[PDB]
Amino acid sequence: MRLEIPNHTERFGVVRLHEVQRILELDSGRVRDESPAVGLRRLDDADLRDVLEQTAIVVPTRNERLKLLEGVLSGIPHEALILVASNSSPDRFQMERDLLEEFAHLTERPALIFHQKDPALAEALRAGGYPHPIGEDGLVRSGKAEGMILALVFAALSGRRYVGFIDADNYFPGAVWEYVRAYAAGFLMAKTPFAMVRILWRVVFRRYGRVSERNNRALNQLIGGVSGFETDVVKTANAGEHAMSLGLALRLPLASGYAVEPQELVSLLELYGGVFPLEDEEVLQHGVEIFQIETRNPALHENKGDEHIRDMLLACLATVYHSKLATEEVRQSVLEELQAAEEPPPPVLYPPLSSLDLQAVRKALRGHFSRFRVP
Amino acid sequence: MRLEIPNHTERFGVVRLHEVQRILELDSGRVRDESPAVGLRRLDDADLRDVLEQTAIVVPTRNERLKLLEGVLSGIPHEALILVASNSSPDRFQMERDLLEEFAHLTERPALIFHQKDPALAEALRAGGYPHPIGEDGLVRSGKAEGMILALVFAALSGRRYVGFIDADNYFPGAVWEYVRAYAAGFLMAKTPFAMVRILWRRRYGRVSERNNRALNQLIGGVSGFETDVVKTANAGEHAMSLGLALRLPLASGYAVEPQELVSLLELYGGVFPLEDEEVLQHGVEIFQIETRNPALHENKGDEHIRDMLLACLATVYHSKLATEEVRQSVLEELQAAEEPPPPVLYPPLSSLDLQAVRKALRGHFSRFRVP
Numbered sequence A: 001m002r003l004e005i006p007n008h009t010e011r012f013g014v015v016r017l018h019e020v021q022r023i024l025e026l027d028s029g030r031v032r033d034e035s036p037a038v039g040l041r042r043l044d045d046a047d048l049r050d051v052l053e054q055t056a057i058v059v060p061t062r063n064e065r066l067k068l069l070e071g072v073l074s075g076i077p078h079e080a081l082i083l084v085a086s087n088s089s090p091d092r093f094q095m096e097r098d099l100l101e102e103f104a105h106l107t108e109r110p111a112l113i114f115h116q117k118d119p120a121l122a123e124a125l126r127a128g129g130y131p132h133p134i135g136e137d138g139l140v141r142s143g144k145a146e147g148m149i150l151a152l153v154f155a156a157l158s159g160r161r162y163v164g165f166i167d168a169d170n171y172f173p174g175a176v177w178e179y180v181r182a183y184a185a186g187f188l189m190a191k192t193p194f195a196m197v198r199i200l201w202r203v204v205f206r207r208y209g210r211v212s213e214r215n216n217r218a219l220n221q222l223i224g225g226v227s228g229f230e231t232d233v234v235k236t237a238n239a240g241e242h243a244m245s246l247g248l249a250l251r252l253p254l255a256s257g258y259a260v261e262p263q264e265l266v267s268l269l270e271l272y273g274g275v276f277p278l279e280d281e282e283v284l285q286h287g288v289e290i291f292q293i294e295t296r297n298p299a300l301h302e303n304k305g306d307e308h309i310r311d312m313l314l315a316c317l318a319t320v321y322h323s324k325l326a327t328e329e330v331r332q333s334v335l336e337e338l339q340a341a342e343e344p345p346p347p348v349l350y351p352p353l354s355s356l357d358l359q360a361v362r363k364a365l366r367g368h369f370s371r372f373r374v375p
Numbered sequence B: 001m002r003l004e005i006p007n008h009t010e011r012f013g014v015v016r017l018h019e020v021q022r023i024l025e026l027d028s029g030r031v032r033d034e035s036p037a038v039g040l041r042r043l044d045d046a047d048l049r050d051v052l053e054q055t056a057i058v059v060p061t062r063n064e065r066l067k068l069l070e071g072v073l074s075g076i077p078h079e080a081l082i083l084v085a086s087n088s089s090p091d092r093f094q095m096e097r098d099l100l101e102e103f104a105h106l107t108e109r110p111a112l113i114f115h116q117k118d119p120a121l122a123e124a125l126r127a128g129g130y131p132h133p134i135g136e137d138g139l140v141r142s143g144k145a146e147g148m149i150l151a152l153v154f155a156a157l158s159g160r161r162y163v164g165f166i167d168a169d170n171y172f173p174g175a176v177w178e179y180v181r182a183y184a185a186g187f188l189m190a191k192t193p194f195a196m197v198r199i200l201w202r203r204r205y206g207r208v209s210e211r212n213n214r215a216l217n218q219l220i221g222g223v224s225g226f227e228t229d230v231v232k233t234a235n236a237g238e239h240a241m242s243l244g245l246a247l248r249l250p251l252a253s254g255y256a257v258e259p260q261e262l263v264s265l266l267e268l269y270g271g272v273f274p275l276e277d278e279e280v281l282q283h284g285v286e287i288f289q290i291e292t293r294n295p296a297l298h299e300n301k302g303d304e305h306i307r308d309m310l311l312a313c314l315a316t317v318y319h320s321k322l323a324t325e326e327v328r329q330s331v332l333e334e335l336q337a338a339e340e341p342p343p344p345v346l347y348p349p350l351s352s353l354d355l356q357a358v359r360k361a362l363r364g365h366f367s368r369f370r371v372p
């Protein structure tokens, strides 16, 4: 895989936000004689594979068609560990286990499947002192974020060093394959243990674009509000397909809705933008790199209810508005746009996972790891 | 890449035609241990790439959009040589050379591009004593098959062992990438120098292909005297073959090109007629049909051609030296229901062509087929 090297990079405390890099060549082979281009970077196949041998890939699912979900699995590079974070109806779920069990047997590779609503998982989180996403039913709330939180735990428990997410509504297994290799690309290029790779692709769909352009703006306005100089650097406010080093995810709080992806950025700034005093010495001396990679394959998802467009505009502007770094002018610009689609709701934030006692969780799930695992 | 095992194989002379194989896992990583587990075939990445380093990938193009074309290019694995066989308007062709010169420069790889109406090529074919595809005007006729021919020549000259084709109208680089890897998968699975790989992806087009495959299966069954289900790639834009097999096959002009390939494999190597080719008689021919994970999504306009697809393919069969009265009739009934049938235009095998002559005749020119 060859990519553009980023022209400019946004320094913001110890955070480094790179501008969008295009993938030029999907598969650039096995190096042998290197040859140095300053303008782009060629990533060795072996190198990518080795990265993925340390990567977990999370496929979040709630009542997705089985054909699609198996399509997605077949696209994931062999080296990566598959975690299926499920929240489907019990019937559907048991079908998902069966599907994953067969795929993983046939392709001789380890996978993990678990259901968001497991009492054992709730029980485990309490034992680890992270009882924040547990609802009144006594069990973990519904939401994609909540599943991710659980997958992160599994990821941590499995000793994988990088985590990436991939939506299960993909029509194109080959686009999945590109996302996963792009994650690895980004982690190679990264020169810090703290790193995040966000993918973008460039009557109905035509309106999604004006929203993302406005979401992106809102975030650049935020950054500029601190910096004093205005920027266009962020192009990935929303990024369903994004990955981050495990060390970095345990460190970030995560919001709940369509606020999850944009809040990660807001959290990175608030934490490491060097406005507030920085606690973590390791982040202090390695810094953070955020990568924005633009993909060769068109994104094609299955949609079936698109009221959610207004909703995600709302969620992301809310984030920015409520950030501890938003200056009046930024808060105002965000108010006007919204009321232009008299009140602004605050996002729901779960504390960083670093807080969770892994040992306790581990103890909690002794008897059960058997059934999360598929051979 | 992990594939299913063909549930069954048609032996027809020294030809072996394998039943469709699904791709199960796009990228099966690096073997380091072993268990070819009864069910399936697992192909090492290293092996895949070593094959592709011997592969040319032809991309034919006639006024295709530049963005599409470059997308297709970005999808071709590094290891493969890119020949772009063009037949666009002369303005557009210059944009194409530009496009390719840039890509190949940036991604540090070699590529060839040629126009199908180049006088040097018509002249070179004549030098090699292959005057067959040259037109009235003194130039190689327009048509994809004519462009494919020219590519196979360039392929032969560049010393590559395998040629594959990829239509430039693809929306997905990843689909291209899967095609190219699947071609190498076939060539590895094969146990003979002479091997072919045919890709399929599973509204009016539906019936037509069902009926075209049926047409070949009836042809095949006609000779063996037992029915078969095996052909499912009667048409296959995206197909590859070992160069040794391609120089051995005659080629048809229309949409006829792909089906004829199979009709020709029967005629030549099914051993109804006597088989005179030491090497093919000793080694035999394997044909793979691989089913792809990625939906096919191309760009098309004014899709009338579905009918012309049917007529082309069923004509191939009708006029086979191996067609029986029954097949012939069956074929007529079908066409008639969409009183008189046309025989295809068939170019002789490229094996006859003198490359030494072509090499001589293309001296001062190779410089401009090759992009740095």
Ligand SMILES: Nc1nc2c(ncn2[C@@H]2O[C@H](COP(=O)(O)OP(=O)(O)O[C@H]3O[C@H](CO)[C@@H](O)[C@H](O)[C@@H]3O)[C@@H](O)[C@H]2O)c(=O)[nH]1
Residues within 6 Å of the ligand: A060, A061, A062, A063, A064, A085, A086, A087, A116, A142, A143, A144, A147, A148, A167, A168, A169, A238, A239, A240, A241, A258, A260, A261, A301, A308
């Ligand atoms: N574990 C879990 N998974 C869920 C849940 N709800 C949905 N999912 C799964 O997670 C994905 C959510 O995708 P959609 O529900 O289709 O969301 P969207 O409207 O497509 O928005 C997506 O794309 C945006 C841009 O890429 C993202 O901003 C957003 O986060 C989401 O990924 C799907 O695979 C779905 O099956 C849940 O409560 N729990």
Ligand SMILES: Nc1nc2c(ncn2[C@@H]2O[C@H](COP(=O)(O)OP(=O)(O)O[C@H]3O[C@H](CO)[C@@H](O)[C@H](O)[C@@H]3O)[C@@H](O)[C@H]2O)c(=O)[nH]1
Residues within 6 Å of the ligand: B059, B060, B061, B062, B063, B064, B085, B086, B087, B116, B142, B143, B144, B146, B147, B148, B166, B167, B168, B169, B235, B236, B237, B238, B255, B257, B258, B298, B305
């Ligand atoms: N060199 C050359 N190329 C051509 C010519 N005409 C078309 N091409 C190029 O070769 C490919 C032919 O694609 P289409 O013209 O879209 O043909 P189609 O109707 O889409 O049918 C294709 O798919 C079928 C099944 O996959 C095939 O039956 C058929 O061969 C063809 O490849 C495209 O990249 C096109 O630009 C030509 O006269 N000369």
Ligand SMILES: [Mg+2]
Residues within 6 Å of the ligand: A167, A169, A301, A302, A303
């Ligand atoms: Mg979706």
Ligand SMILES: [Mg+2]
Residues within 6 Å of the ligand: B167, B169, B298, B299, B300
């Ligand atoms: Mg086409």
Ligand SMILES: [Zn+2]
Residues within 6 Å of the ligand: A007, A008, A019
């Ligand atoms: Zn810039």
Ligand SMILES: [Zn+2]
Residues within 6 Å of the ligand: B007, B008, B019, B229, B230
């Ligand atoms: Zn069969």
Ligand SMILES: [Zn+2]
Residues within 6 Å of the ligand: B279, B282, B283
């Ligand atoms: Zn031999």
